[PDB]
Amino acid sequence: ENSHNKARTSPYPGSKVERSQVPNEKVGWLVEWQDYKPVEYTAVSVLAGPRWADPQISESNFSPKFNEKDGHVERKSKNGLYEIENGRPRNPAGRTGLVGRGLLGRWGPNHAADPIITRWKRDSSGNKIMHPVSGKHILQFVAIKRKDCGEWAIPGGMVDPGEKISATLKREFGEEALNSLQKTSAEKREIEEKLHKLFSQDHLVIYKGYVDDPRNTDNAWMETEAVNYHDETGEIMDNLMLEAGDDAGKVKWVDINDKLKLYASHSQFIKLVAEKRDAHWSEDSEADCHAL
Ligand SMILES: O=P(O)(O)OCC1O[C@@H](O)[C@H](O)[C@@H]1O
Ligand SMILES: [Mg+2]
Ligand SMILES: [Mg+2]
Q: In sequence order, what are the residues at sequence separation of 6 or more whose Cβ sits closer than 8 angstroms to the Cβ of residue 23? A: none
Ligand 1 atom closest to the Cα of residue 114 is: 14
**Residues near ion ligand 2 (Cβ under 5 Å):** 157
Regarding the beta carbon of 231 and ligand 1, being less than 6 Å apart is answered: no
Q: Which-ligand-closest: CA of 175?
A: 2
Q: Is the CB of 157 under 6 A from ligand 1?
A: yes
CA of residue 244 relative to chain centroid, distance: 18
Given CATH 1.10.238.10, say whether it is the number of domain 111-211+223-292.
no
| Technique used to solve these coordinates | X-ray
Could you tell me the resolution of this structure in angstroms?
Answer: 1.9
Q: Which string of DSSP letters, residue by residue, matches 105-169?
A: SSSEEEEEEEEEEEEE-B-TTS-B-B-TTT-SB-EEEEEEEETTT--EE---EEPPTT--HHHHH
Q: How far is the CA of 219 from the centre of ligand 3 (A)?
A: 22
Write phi, then psi, for 96 (nearest 5 degrees).
-125, -10
Cβ–ligand 1 contact at 105 (below 6 Å) = no
Strands (E), the chain: 39-42, 69-70, 73-74, 84-85, 88-89, 98-102, 108-120, 139-146, 152-153, 157-158, 204-210, 220-231, 248-255
Ligand 1 proximity of 116 Cβ (cutoff 6 Å) = no
Whether ligand 1 lies within 6 angstroms of the CB of 156 is answered as yes
Within the chain, which residue ranges are assigned CATH 3.90.79.10?
Answer: 111-211+223-292
Encode 78-97: b = buried (16+ Cβ within 10 Å), e = exposed. beeebeeeeebbbbbbbbbb
Give SS3 for 254: strand
Ligand 3 centre from 158 Cα, in Å? 7
Q: Is 51 exposed, middle or buried (0-12, 13-18, 19+ CB in 10 A)?
A: exposed
Residue 205's SS3 state is: strand
Least Cα distance to 173 among 216, 148, 203, 143 occurs for: 143
Ligand 2 centroid–CA 19 distance in Å is 27
Whether a cis peptide bond, with omega within 30° of 0, leads into 11 is yes
